[PDB]
Every structure is written in C-alpha cells, then in structure tokens.
Amino acid sequence: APTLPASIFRAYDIRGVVGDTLTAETAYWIGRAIGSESLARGEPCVAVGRDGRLSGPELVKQLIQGLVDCGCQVSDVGMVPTPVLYYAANVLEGKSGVMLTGSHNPPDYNGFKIVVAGETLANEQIQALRERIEKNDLASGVGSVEQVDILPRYFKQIRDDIAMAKPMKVVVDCGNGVAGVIAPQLIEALGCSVIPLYCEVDGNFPNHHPDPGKPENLKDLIAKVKAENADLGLAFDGDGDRVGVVTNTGTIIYPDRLLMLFAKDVVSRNPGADIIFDVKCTRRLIALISGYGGRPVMWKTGHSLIKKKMKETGALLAGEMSGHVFFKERWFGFDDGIYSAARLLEILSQDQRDSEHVFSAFGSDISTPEINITVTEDSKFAIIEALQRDAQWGEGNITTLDGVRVDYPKGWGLVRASNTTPVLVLRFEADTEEELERIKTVFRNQLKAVDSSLPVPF
C-alpha cells in the first residue's frame, strides 16, 4: 500500500480531485480497506454503484478490484443515484455498499460514501480505513463480481407504495447529474406531467452545477415553473440524496419547512413517533412535532450522523437543513431525494390548495440563510470550544451537541464548525426583525470576544 493523502479522508465520506488527490491507485486501496472492514464485520457481499461523473467508469473498476482482492462478493449496480445504492445494500444479499460519487461538486471531484454491515461510516470509522492502508491491515482473497440490474426494482418499489390522488404538473431539474436516470420517469409514472430541465446525464455539468441549496441553481426551474403554469418545481443534487422544492408561484421551500409537512403526515399516522432534525432547523419543528404527539429529537449535522441517530432512536423520519430527508416509515431510513419527492407529491396531490398555500399555511418567522465565516483549519474547532467553554449568552436554553445553539423566548441562533471546510456556519431565526438583530448582536459580541479579528458579516 502507498501513502495516500490524509485530506481525502473526511467526516462523513471520502472526497478528492481526480488525477490529483484521487487516482486509480487511491480507489483500489480504498476498496481494499472497505473490503477488509466489511469482512471483519462478517459481510463478504458488497454492492457497488457510481454516479454520472466523467471519472466514474474508470475509477469504479479500481474500487471493484480492491474489494475483489479481499475475497469480497461484489454486486455491480452500474450507474445509479446514491439512494439506489443504499437501497441495493438493503434488499440484496449483503448489507455493505460503496457509492463512488462526488455529490454536487465541480466535474473533477469524485469520492466514496460507504455502508458496512448496515452502518454508514463516519468520523473514526473513516479514519479506521485510512489507518488500515497505512498499516497494511488488509485482507486477501479471490473474490467475484456479478452485475445486478437494480433500478427497475427500486422504481417498482416506490411506484407500488405511492398513491397520488390527482394528477400534477411538475418541472424536474436534475442539473445533468445522475438523478436524470429515474426521477422524470418515476414522477410521470406516479401520475404526473413532467417538464424536464437538464435531465440528460452529463458529467461536464454544462448548465448549472447540480446543487439545489444555492438559489441561483434554482433560477431556471423557477422561471420554467411560472412559464409553464406548473404545480411544483423539483430539483436534485448531483447524486440524488438531496431534493429542492419550488412552489407554483416560484417560492423556494427551505428543507426544514419541507420537514414540517413530512413530520405532520408521518406523526399523524404513528402517534408518539420520533422525528429527528439537525441544529440548523427552525424551532417551529419542535412545536409541530410535539403538537401532533410526536417526539422531536434535535441532532448533529451530517448524513452519516443522522442515519446513526435514527437507528438509536427508532425515528420514523429525519431531515437536515441541507436538504437530505430520511424516511424510515414505509421505507429503509436512508436519505433519498427521489423517494422524498414521491412522498411530497403524494401529500400535495391530496390537498385542494396549490403548493404555495399548502406551505404558506405553516406561517413564518424572520430567518437568515446559512452564513459562513472563513476561519482556519487550525482554529475552527478551537473557536467553538472557546465559545462552549466561556461564552456568555444571557438568558436562553443553550445547546452544545454540535457547536453552540441558543434558543431565546423569541428566537434562536447557531454557530458550528463545518466538518468539510475551514469555516464557521451560522443561522438565526426570530419572531421579529428587532429580535433577529438582538440575537445576531449577541453572537457577534461572543465571537469578537474569542478573536476581535474575526470577520463577522452581520
């Protein structure tokens, strides 16, 4: 084994720039490492999937070989969305799966999301593979590969369990990512008319990057929805584990709003059920979950960390501000933008109101988008520690499971470190503009007390 760069081994996945920090050799050894760990957990069967990035076809061969060279039985499911790979690792013989994807990033990025024996790896488990390659703590065997055509199985699974009450007109924007393989087809099969936008799978991303979290990547969907008098706009990120929602009047629906609608529907069918959300989500979620008799669980940001939490709590649903939505009710508990789109359409089809009025019916508060402060990699965790240790917030409920969050009577604010970039991530919400500004001023002062050079942009 060679000496791989440590930067590519991250908190919830492995990611690198192909030809640079991610090469054919890197992919092979990563496959060796994942195969050895899956075999240590008693799992020789590993599903393997890839997204529609230019480097997919080449690099996936190396991943497959590394797993085969452990003695693993590989199920090659070809080019599929991320959640279709997570589904493979739920319905096939083995409970391990590797997805070769670079998510929503520039054409040249690629990487790995890993499930081993039911568990999606995070933090120390990702380092554990890095360390296997360093130590040559690797299995050796003569494995096998079989091709598995899994997409029709998935498609059918969703179609059979969803029941739309009326037809709808839906603009689907796949941003040329791998969602194009199934999203337009399936939504139409549920009973919709589908206006496609950027639905051809093209790893050059010649339109807008498939990242529905940036509002400018929704400009075209919004214009198309209005132009065509459509009922709803939907947008998927590169690999299909995130969705973004636009109303019939062009309103962008923040994922924590989307969760409110899902939470209302799931809890109403399952009294007492647990519902998970990350620390960036509106507080309205607590009240709405509790009101319908559910149990609101606030947790850490990060898909792998949310999946783990759902297994521990038995939550029937989870959601993140980033747009990852995890259904266990009627499903398997992994994030899936395409399945979530199907669940949204189902609910919407049953309402006599247009999508604008269905979502406007949850009212509003004053809130910020995500704010980002670029710090250093040396200092980012230290600042958060310093805030958690020594900051003074005034009267409020202080939550520290991921950064610092303080819920005041009339609003809330959050500061956490990003697990992927040398940045501090903030969000604020409030009943009033004045209160928003009161909270923002508290956070500004507290950050300035740690380091009076920090560029607080509010």
The annotation places the binding site for Mg(2+) at: 103, 237, 239, 241
Active site residue 353: no
Of 247, 301, 355, 446, which one interacts with ligand G1P (CB under 6 A)? 301
Which residue type, as a one-letter code, is found at position 281? C
Applying CB under 6 A, does 322 fall inside the site for ligand G1P? yes
Is 15 labeled as catalytic in the residue annotation?
yes
**Of 153, 189, 142, 100, residue with least CA distance to 332:** 153
Q: What are phi and psi of 15, to 5 degrees?
A: -140, 140
Listed as own residue / partner, the contacts of 156-161 with beta carbons closer than 8 Å and 24 or more positions apart are 157/87, 158/186, 158/338, 158/339, 158/342, 159/186, 159/189, 159/190, 161/330
* Shortest CB 211 distance to Zn ion, Å: 9
Which of the following is catalytic: 130, 283, 324, 405?
Answer: 324
| 62, two tokens | 């190396």
Q: 239 touches which of Zn ion, ligand G1P, none (CB within 5 to 8 A by kind)?
A: Zn ion
Choose the stretch contacting ligand G1P; rule: CB under 6 A; options: 33-41, 147-155, 246-254, 414-422.
414-422
- The CB-of-324 to Zn ion minimum distance in angstroms stands at 8
CB of 175 to Zn ion, least distance (A): 11
Give the nearer residue to ligand G1P in terms of CB position, either 248 or 418: 418
The least distance separating ligand G1P from the CB of residue 362, rounded to whole angstroms, comes to 21
Phi, psi for residue 457 in degrees, rounded to 5: -90, 40
What radius of gyration, in Å, describes the C-alpha atoms of the chain? 22
In whole angstroms, what is the distance from residue 296 CA to residue 260 CA?
A: 11
Q: Does 320 bind ligand G1P (CB under 6 A)?
A: yes
Question: Among 186-194, 260-268, 300-308, 439-447, which window interacts with ligand G1P (CB under 6 A)?
Answer: 300-308
Binding mask 244-283 for ligand G1P (x = CB under 6 A): ----------------------------------------
Q: Which is nearer to Zn ion, 355 or 418 (CB)?
A: 418
The single residue of 75, 96, 103, 355 carrying the catalytic annotation is 103
Q: Helix (H, G, I), strand (E, B), or coil: what is residue 248?
A: coil
- Nearest residue to 324 via CA among 427, 420, 221, 255: 255
- CA distance readout (Å), 107 to 111, 175, 209, 312: 12, 12, 9, 36
Choose between 15 and 132: whose C-beta lies nearer to Zn ion. 15
Of positions 302, 337, 403, 413, contacts ligand G1P by CB under 6 A: 302
Contact 13, 112 (CB under 8 A): yes
Size of the chain in residues: 458
Residues that bind Zn ion (CB under 5 A): 103, 237, 239, 241-242
82 touching ligand G1P, by CB under 6 A:
no
Note whether 419 binds ligand G1P by CB under 6 A. yes
Please list, residue by residue across 266-303, b when 16 or more beta carbons sit within 10 angstroms of its beta carbon and e when fewer do.
bbeebeebbbbbbbbbbbbbbebbeebebebbbbbbbb
Identify whether 41 is a catalytic site residue.
no
Residues noted as catalytic: 15, 103, 324
Which residues bind to ligand G1P, rule: CB under 6 A?
12, 301-303, 320, 322, 324, 418-420, 425
